[PDB]
Design a protein around this ligand. Sequence first.
Ligand SMILES: CC(C)(COP(=O)(O)OP(=O)(O)OC[C@H]1O[C@@H](n2cnc3c(N)ncnc32)[C@H](O)[C@@H]1OP(=O)(O)O)[C@@H](O)C(=O)NCCC(=O)NCCS
Ligand SMILES: CC(C)(COP(=O)(O)OP(=O)(O)OC[C@H]1O[C@@H](n2cnc3c(N)ncnc32)[C@H](O)[C@@H]1OP(=O)(O)O)[C@@H](O)C(=O)NCCC(=O)NCCS
Ligand SMILES: CC(C)(COP(=O)(O)OP(=O)(O)OC[C@H]1O[C@@H](n2cnc3c(N)ncnc32)[C@H](O)[C@@H]1OP(=O)(O)O)[C@@H](O)C(=O)NCCC(=O)NCCS
Ligand SMILES: NC(=O)CCCC[C@@H](S)CCS
Ligand SMILES: NC(=O)CCCC[C@@H](S)CCS
Ligand SMILES: NC(=O)CCCC[C@@H](S)CCS
Lengths: 240, 240, 240
Amino acid sequence: SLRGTTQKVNRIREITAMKTVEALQISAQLTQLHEVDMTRVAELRKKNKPAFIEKHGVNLTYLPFFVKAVVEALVSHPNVNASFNAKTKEMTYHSSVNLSIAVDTPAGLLTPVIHDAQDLSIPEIAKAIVDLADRSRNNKLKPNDLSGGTFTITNIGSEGALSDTPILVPPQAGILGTGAIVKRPVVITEDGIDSIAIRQMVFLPLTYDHQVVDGADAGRFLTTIKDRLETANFEGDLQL
Amino acid sequence: SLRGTTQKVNRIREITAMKTVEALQISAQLTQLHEVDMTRVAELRKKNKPAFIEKHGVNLTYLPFFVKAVVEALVSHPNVNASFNAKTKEMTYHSSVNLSIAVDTPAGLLTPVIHDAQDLSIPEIAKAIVDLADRSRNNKLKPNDLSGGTFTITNIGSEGALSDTPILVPPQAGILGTGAIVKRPVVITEDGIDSIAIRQMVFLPLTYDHQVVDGADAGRFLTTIKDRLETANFEGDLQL
Amino acid sequence: SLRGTTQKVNRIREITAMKTVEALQISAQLTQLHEVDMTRVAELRKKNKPAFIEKHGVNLTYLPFFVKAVVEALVSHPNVNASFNAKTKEMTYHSSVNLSIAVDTPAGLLTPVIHDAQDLSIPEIAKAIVDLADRSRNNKLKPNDLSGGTFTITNIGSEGALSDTPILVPPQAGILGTGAIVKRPVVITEDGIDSIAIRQMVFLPLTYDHQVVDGADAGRFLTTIKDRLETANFEGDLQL
Ligand SMILES: CC(C)(COP(=O)(O)OP(=O)(O)OC[C@H]1O[C@@H](n2cnc3c(N)ncnc32)[C@H](O)[C@@H]1OP(=O)(O)O)[C@@H](O)C(=O)NCCC(=O)NCCS
Ligand SMILES: CC(C)(COP(=O)(O)OP(=O)(O)OC[C@H]1O[C@@H](n2cnc3c(N)ncnc32)[C@H](O)[C@@H]1OP(=O)(O)O)[C@@H](O)C(=O)NCCC(=O)NCCS
Ligand SMILES: CC(C)(COP(=O)(O)OP(=O)(O)OC[C@H]1O[C@@H](n2cnc3c(N)ncnc32)[C@H](O)[C@@H]1OP(=O)(O)O)[C@@H](O)C(=O)NCCC(=O)NCCS
Ligand SMILES: NC(=O)CCCC[C@@H](S)CCS
Ligand SMILES: NC(=O)CCCC[C@@H](S)CCS
Ligand SMILES: NC(=O)CCCC[C@@H](S)CCS
């Protein structure tokens, strides 16, 4: 149908094309990659999935665990939950964590926002993602659902990708991609013995703006997220 | 010889320097990475290499398999074999797949084009790559051999790289890198049993223009390529 | 403390913000990734660490090994230790290797320079890194300690990162990141037998300017570094 034709793009595509080209010219984007052992989260998720759907009415995916860890890291690393004004040379450190979530829709990519995500529990996050994705796909968003974001999470693993260099959109200073969670052979070291284990591993590429965040700051922020996910103390957070 | 000197660059270098700096400013480039199990292609290639050289006169490398899978994916994903006009907001979906191939030459990188690649078999692709690389290296190209490309494949694995973030050149919307194919330990899951196998693995970084392709579209396009290569039903395609 | 405030940034942050945004607009940056087996260097380092601190007064980290291999590669690949003037179309191939080292400080990232690094031994490199990092952190640098660099090495593995797409700053044409050195299961092939070994592996992302270096040139340069590190003939270089 499309093949061999020239057609005017829809408004979402036109806006995305304009915003992404401009975004790269008014920021200094680079992507740092860390690997995280998601096995404990995967086991916790598998064990509690039936009780979660029964009590909260929504499916329990990996995304609310990534959101909870990222939002707590943005509170303890306020330098990342920030915006730079290149005209006045002032940095604004936001008190709210307004978390943008990339949502794939048939008309194009949309980035709705979970406002004040720092006040939400894992069940509330799971419900907000479902509500935003549904309203994004059915033209039921309001303008304020698409603005005010202070950081973004993009699920690049939804379509099989291990990694990407996602584009951040100023005034945001960071966008985290959640790669595909894949079983991999990894090395475990305990009591001086190196051995090979099968673990659920994920790559987390973080695109950050070098105007706001330096490489070591990005590493410290990603280390906080990694340690939270690897310990996986989320049982109480599930409110079952 | 070069060390401690200042010299005027040759024309290929001057053009590359100008085109690549400009390309990044008029597009929104990002690179998505997937991993593909090339074992079946490697076994098929090893088994049929002698019969291929004897019948078709050229060596059988991995590149014609990547080209065949990519060209079929560009036909089934017309949204990727496309160009965006930022002035009129129109997308042109090309009917031809004119596949650019990056060729390393002593005077610099050249990107000759296989026009109407969708009409070619694996032997015809193998011969066209050899012809274009030879004419690129011996100053025997014509101007139309270097224009009209709708997508590019760059063999970054030729010099050992696992991955890269290759630069696309508008009006193209995508450029795929074929990383070095390396034996790696990977996890196989069958009948509920996780186990470790040695497989020939490759990383395929795709740089795409966010004006034309969103992240989920890139993932769906790369999934089509991955499934074609992993199944490796190419015996009949070899025309032996 | 920062949360909920707007504050004027310090001078280092203001300069970094300005330089990194501009750098991307006057160059064609891309990042090629190779993997290197650091096991032999790790064993050599562990065995000689006590004798190194006793004789040279400084701790022996992995960074002087990366610096030695990179500096020798910049001498044998003069096309990488070079600067492009886009106005005159002239390439300057530097005779000195002035190696910039990224240093994380509490006030922000600084990039001091080891001038004429090609004339230094591993102990001299180890001492120069310690001196530059100390003076960077205690406001004891002079202006010429921060200029004249021909290439940069950035230790992204200091804060846990496997990889990054570091930003180069013109007139430099390349910046190498040293990822976190991690034990991984890898495939060894000897006498026709494929087997799985535990090795200390590192990813080395190289951001290069496409105005100066093409992808195959970057691969050849990284292959020289990889072969030097994997052979690890550095015993005599330690001067113990
Ligand atoms: C100045 C600087 C480069 C010195 O690094 P260094 O020579 O490796 O020295 P350090 O004292 O920091 O290293 C501490 C230890 O970590 C180890 N280490 C450092 N980098 C490592 C890496 N990439 N992988 C594994 N181990 C590493 C060292 O070998 C040393 O080990 P040991 O105590 O057992 O001997 C470093 O302090 C720094 O500032 N790094 C950050 C650079 C930066 O901000 N880059 C920007 C992008 S993140
Ligand atoms: C709205 C959205 C983010 C919700 O994602 P989600 O919370 O993971 O929910 P989904 O219903 O899509 O997930 C379906 C399944 O895949 C799994 N899954 C999703 N992402 C995964 C990942 N990164 N790795 C492994 N499994 C994953 C989920 O756990 C779930 O598994 P289950 O059915 O066994 O319970 C998602 O539909 C979406 O739009 N993703 C694409 C985002 C995008 O386009 N980003 C741009 C760059 S690609
Ligand atoms: C023209 C060109 C693309 C042809 O590549 P090709 O079809 O793979 O052919 P080659 O003759 O170079 O390949 C030589 C061998 O390496 C193998 N090989 C090539 N690429 C490989 C890869 N990615 N992984 C593993 N093996 C590979 C081939 O299968 C062949 O093996 P064999 O001799 O055992 O049969 C190539 O010569 C070239 O110029 N590559 C560089 C492209 C470039 O500069 N890109 C820019 C970014 S680096
Ligand atoms: N709807 C849009 O215009 C989104 C453009 C930016 C997308 C980024 S933040 C996520 C994928 S790289
Ligand atoms: N001959 C050229 O000017 C090519 C410039 C662009 C090269 C890209 S498409 C491939 C390597 S990133
Ligand atoms: N002090 C600075 O302005 C450094 C800016 C550039 C940093 C790069 S070279 C290394 C991290 S990407």
